[PDB]
Design a binder for this molecule. Structure first.
Ligand SMILES: Cc1cn([C@H]2C[C@H](O)[C@@H](COP(=O)(O)OP(=O)(O)OP(=O)(O)O)O2)c(=O)[nH]c1=O
Ligand SMILES: [Mg+2]
Length: 428
DNA sequence: GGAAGGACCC
DNA sequence: CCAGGGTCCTTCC
């Protein structure tokens, strides 16, 4: 019921939030304006000469469409909520969510029927579901359950690659090979007369999920596909405790990618969705048809991206676990406009940043402060030394200054902060 | 390589 | 009266 989309829009109307949200949107239509206008200044010649480019490239892309790997994307269901429910029977049959009055990280599925969703403000969620119990996050409790599950996964692909605590990719192609020759008792599990799983990628995933539930009590969903991109889209097709596969042939990819909302693809945000919708693009088939216009309107990197999606292409090799490019700490709070205090709230952030930094014994050389007006407007000043910071005082050194400069930049005006934060980056 | 501003993911 | 952790992509010296 859109009584939801009303209670929300209603409880947002005058907020300084909707305020900046409007300014945000006005700036997107401008980016779009600068596009349609940019478009109009294109001639059939340029355009056709382009169709030639893209069509060739695509022709190559197409010759190297790898369909040998059986990638699997696994996604825990309502992770934080689910976990908090498991640790506390009290919440058993009640609707919950994990967050604060100002922000929910998720809502179990019962709460979802009421319109409550992740990233929705708490006070609003309480508007749609007064009976909503809101549990504070407990990440360590999550990393835990996440390690517990990563254990079950190592079995099918010791080199899996975790995207976030509740998601992961798996190249079960090798497992499937050895599994074709596995005695039924090597795929028989006892429930806690029981069950035995087949040899299909369909079945191994069916097993992987089974194990995960049996072990942590939480259900998960999975997508089975020829490559990364398709898999993550599939893991949501039946999302609550289900799975969906896309067979290893090109038509299968095609039949799925056809009519598939461009926005369901990972990387296409609410913003580029609106820009492509401007050009008349909603699905992947529409997106493909426009492979010409796109090469003239977007970065080589973007339309390159756009082309793979339109053709159902994507990673097929799970790269090694990269490295940490940065580490930050930031807090929101009831307005703080007093300078003495802001220098204090900062000392804290720096001190915290310093300790989470010691846990990984990391040392970077670039510190960025981050400030957010009472109007959500956001500044962000960097500063890179050449000695390699580490300690709390060291960081708070660059930071303190970085901050001073922005206070002064307001000469007699005090910075009306709602948010402040610190990020150290540039490690070895 | 930096410094600013953003889009997107969870 | 709208979070917080991270990564990657332009845009200017
Ligand atoms: C989206 C989103 C997720 N998360 C957290 C909440 C989730 O427990 C966790 C996983 O992301 P999601 O997978 O998108 O959330 P979910 O798994 O709980 O729900 P679903 O069953 O639809 O997959 O990360 C955030 O903290 N902030 C966010 O903005
Ligand atoms: Mg999930």
């Amino acid at each position: 019921k859109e009584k939801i989309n009303k209670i929300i829009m209603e409880a947002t109307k005058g907020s300084r939030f909707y305020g900046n949200e409007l300014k945000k949107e006005k700036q997107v239509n401008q980016r779009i304006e600068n596009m349609m206008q940019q478009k109009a200044q294109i001639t059939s010649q340029q355009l056709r000469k382009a169709q030639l480019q893209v069509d060739r490239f695509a022709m190559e892309l197409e010759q190297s469409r790898n369909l040998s790997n059986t990638i699997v994307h696994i996604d825990m269901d309502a992770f934080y909520a689910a976990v908090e429910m498991r640790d506390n029977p009290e919440l058993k049959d009640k609707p919950i969510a994990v967050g604060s009055m100002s922000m929910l990280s998720t809502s179990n599925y019962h709460a979802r029927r009421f319109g409550v969703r992740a990233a929705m403000p708490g006070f609003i969620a309480k508007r749609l579901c007064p009976q909503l119990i809101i549990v504070p996050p407990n990440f360590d409790k999550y990393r835990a359950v996440s390690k517990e599950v990563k254990e079950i996964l190592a079995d099918y692909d010791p080199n899996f690659m975790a995207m976030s605590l509740d998601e992961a990719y798996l190249n079960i192609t090798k497992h499937l090979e050895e599994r074709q020759n596995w005695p039924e008792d090597k795929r028989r599990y006892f429930i806690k007369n029981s069950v035995v799983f087949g040899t299909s990628a369909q079945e191994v995933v069916k097993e992987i999920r089974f194990r995960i539930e049996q072990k942590t009590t939480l259900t998960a969903s999975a997508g089975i596909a020829p490559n990364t991109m398709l898999a993550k889209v599939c893991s949501d097709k039946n999302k609550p405790n289900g799975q969906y596969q896309i067979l290893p042939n090109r038509q299968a990819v095609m039949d799925f990618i056809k009519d598939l909302p461009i926005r369901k693809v990972s990387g296409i945000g609410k913003v580029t969705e609106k820009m492509l919708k401007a050009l008349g693009i909603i699905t992947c088939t529409e997106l493909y048809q426009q492979r010409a216009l796109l090469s003239l309107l977007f970065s080589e990197t973007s339309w390159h991206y756009f082309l793979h999606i339109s053709l159902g292409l994507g990673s097929t090799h799970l790269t090694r676990d990269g490295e940490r490019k940065s580490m930050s700490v930031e807090r929101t709070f009831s307005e703080i406009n007093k300078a003495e205090e802001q220098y204090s709230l900062c000392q804290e952030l720096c001190s915290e940043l310093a300790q989470d930094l010691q846990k990984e014994r990391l040392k970077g050389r670039t510190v960025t402060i981050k400030l957010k007006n009472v109007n959500f407007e956001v500044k962000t000043r960097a500063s890179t030394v050449s000695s390699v910071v580490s300690t709390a005082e060291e960081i708070f050194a660059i930071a303190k200054e970085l901050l001073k400069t922005e206070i002064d930049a307001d000469f007699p005006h005090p910075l009306r902060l709602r948010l402040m934060g610190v990020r150290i980056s540039s490690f070895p």
